[PDB]
Assembly symmetry: D2
Homo-oligomer: 254 residues x 4
């Protein structure tokens, strides 16, 4: 007989985009599970508010100014975490934005900004993290925040769908490369969640366009994603390495 593992005591996690939404719930969930957590965001003030809440709730956290499009900012922020907490056991590459336009109208600047945040961010944070994890084959976990848009398309989201599909590719290479150093990789693929990234979109409908391909017309929640991220991060074996897991109430059945 067995039981679920969820203790991250002694572990150090870095979550990008951790000032808000899904990242913030993953960070606070990891801190409640006993991890020391780096709150990495381009918004340093918002990151420090998250850290203050985590510390008041009895956890350990560090606010890290990090534009994930910048090699220097990624390398310096990972080093700050390692200097502060002694290492890095978990990376969640979660920072993201949305920019909506049809391909024939979309600015090339907006295309490149989307790939810079979603794909360059994923590459830079992965490379920095695994350089530490590969030391003495101690290993670690890398989770990418994908989407149902890793697996299928929607109108007017060309660069987002391109990026979220690409994150599967990066995850699958890291599973192969990382195996020899005890590094496992996963992609979590949510459906729509009522974060600021989405409550933004609703004004600029729920049952008829956004939840139309769910089986039950339910939003995915931040706690759905944070529970799956804790289950993966705490998992005692590398059995899930290379996998994507869709959390979408039946929108794309993987």
């Amino acid at each position: 007989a067995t039981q679920l593992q969820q203790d991250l005591t002694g572990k150090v996690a870095l979550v990008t985009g951790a000032a808000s939404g899904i990242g913030r719930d993953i960070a606070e969930t990891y801190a409640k599970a006993g991890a020391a957590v780096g709150i990495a965001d381009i918004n340093l003030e918002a990151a420090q508010k998250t850290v203050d809440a985590i510390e008041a709730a009895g956890g350990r956290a560090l606010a890290i100014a990090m534009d994930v499009t910048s090699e220097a900012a990624v390398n310096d922020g990972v080093q700050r975490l390692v200097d502060t907490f002694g290492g890095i056991d978990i990376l969640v590459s979660n920072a993201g934005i949305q920019i909506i336009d049809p391909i024939h109208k979309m600015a090339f600047e907006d295309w490149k900004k989307m790939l810079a945040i979603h794909l360059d961010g994923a590459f830079l944070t992965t490379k920095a993290a695994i350089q530490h994890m590969y030391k003495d084959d101690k290993g670690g976990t890398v989770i990418y925040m994908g989407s149902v848009h890793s697996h299928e398309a929607s109108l007017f989201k060309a660069p987002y769908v391109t990026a979220k599909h690409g994150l599967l590719g990066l995850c699958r290479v890291l599973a192969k490369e990382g195996a020899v150093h005890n590094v496992r990789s996963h992609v979590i693929c949510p459906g729509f969640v009522k974060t600021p990234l989405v409550e933004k979109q609703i004004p600029q409908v729920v049952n008829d366009i956004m939840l139309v391909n769910t089986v039950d017309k339910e939003f995915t929640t931040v706690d759905d994603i944070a529970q799956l991220a804790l289950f993966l991060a705490a998992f005692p074996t590398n059995v899930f390495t290379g996998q994507s897991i869709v959390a979408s109430h039946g929108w794309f059945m993987n």
Copy 2:
């Protein structure tokens, strides 16, 4: 901030194939979490041994003689569980066998036996279970035991690969039909696990091919893992408990591959 849910207190589960291997660990893990478990298997005596181990640890279980190929045996055993513990919240359709032969040699009766156990067993237990779960839209969880062989093929396993592919289809239909009744469906897709279904295969293939058992394991069975590791019964029982206990229906219709990087879904 949140945390994992793993409490099945007050829940009733039926696990087919629970005398052995993956099903036995899922049943014992569900009982440890507070579920009452129906142990459904071909022989009452073999099922009763799993019941004995659950009762020794302070859990509640019932041995159910159920050949999942039989409509009457499936209907009668599901009714016995409901009559005993008051309902059914969780079905795990897990009973299986392996018959190995290339298509051009495979006996038609072996093809039919394989689809009956894997596919008719999944239909019959599903239909009997959701009759109860659909009542007053109480709802429940149906888990199918698929495989990496739900998603790709291996030599000499046509009916097995056909069946494990088919179970994704049944799960996807049940996700759509069950939603209005609070029924969620899932497929767990293990890589090789060293149950008796596999431990039998190792000496056999070593002798046929005239290679070491190490070669069978490393160059044939685990050749497409990234790390040359078997999946374990505890891997699959932890995933089954994570899904059975999950507080929302967010995973309904999904397959999750637990294979050490053999087919990256």
Copy 3:
């Protein structure tokens, strides 16, 4: 610089379900390309009508009474084609029916009938065909008629979706086993095609739901196409001829979806 190959001169094809719909067009298209075609279907008279149209256009065909659920009927009909035209180069396993009911209402005998036609029919015709194709490693092409329902689910179609998922598995195993004998396998996955199997469904679902036939077509059947278009029998016959005539085994084990953007594979 290259060009398409579409010459089947000197080839012998067997198409199951070729009295009607998708199978009839594939058979007539293969004959036009110079193949001799076995028209296999439940009734000799219905199959003979397809043979009549092929002969009128200057082609060679044979009506074969074959219930693909029967091992003896399948073995006897494959032998008749081989005895008549000297061999079998191409199998298209296409015979099918649709039975619509939600899982909780579906008769077990309807589940079993569906898997027998789609899955036992695919095993039996495959095994009988490759006995011949494996001789002297002459080789050949096996095409399964899958569906979008090979890859995703719809309400009330559990056995159909289970079967069409299963055919991907059988195709993937045959790709691995057949390679050493120059046998290649493929699954064609159409969206909705207005054959009699579908034209029957439109009035029926309009009457049950109390909606227009336009609504059945646009809001139910084609709702997940990008352009609200049916797939056609000529779409599927052109893909079948492209695959049957292809000069290399480059597509072996693949499924190709022909669905106007309904499931993008």
Copy 4:
């Protein structure tokens, strides 16, 4: 009864990376089928040699200097084609390179160069092409050159696998957006082909690493890919819009 369609008489195609390998066979195949073909390459001299061969073989072609990473070079080259032949009916986005390194060793410059060629090239050529195709809903075909690495990973190819996965995403969005203007999109996914991109790799093995996941230990050929590209380009209906088709001798069964 029906038959295969392969006549491109009256049609205008643009193939990127058309000076060499798969692109060159697609271009010459389209020209033999009666299309006027733009031979778009960063190597203008190599492009003009391809054009000379096509013209001597009795076809129509135009050499177009085009770095697909450059918005200006893409827009100017598409306009040159349209000015010369009267429009654009077919785009094959095929230009590519390979850069091999593990994630922990890979230069960030090499990551960005790979995404610039594979993904920015695809975006820029698509946007330019569909602006013409969308005029009076005349429509057209866009084919991306993916890979088995659209669908699964190999060691030491993080940016390539990321890019080829991303091309599925872009194709699936264009199928949805393009449908209202009679534009269809496809991805062709070859396994290994003995082009210069690969005969390069063999020195720097065949049966045991490169063809190990094929069912028959065969290379994919340039004519395999060119036949599939002609079959799609000539297809009388939009039935295959949004689809990827794997041509790999059983390496990844889609």
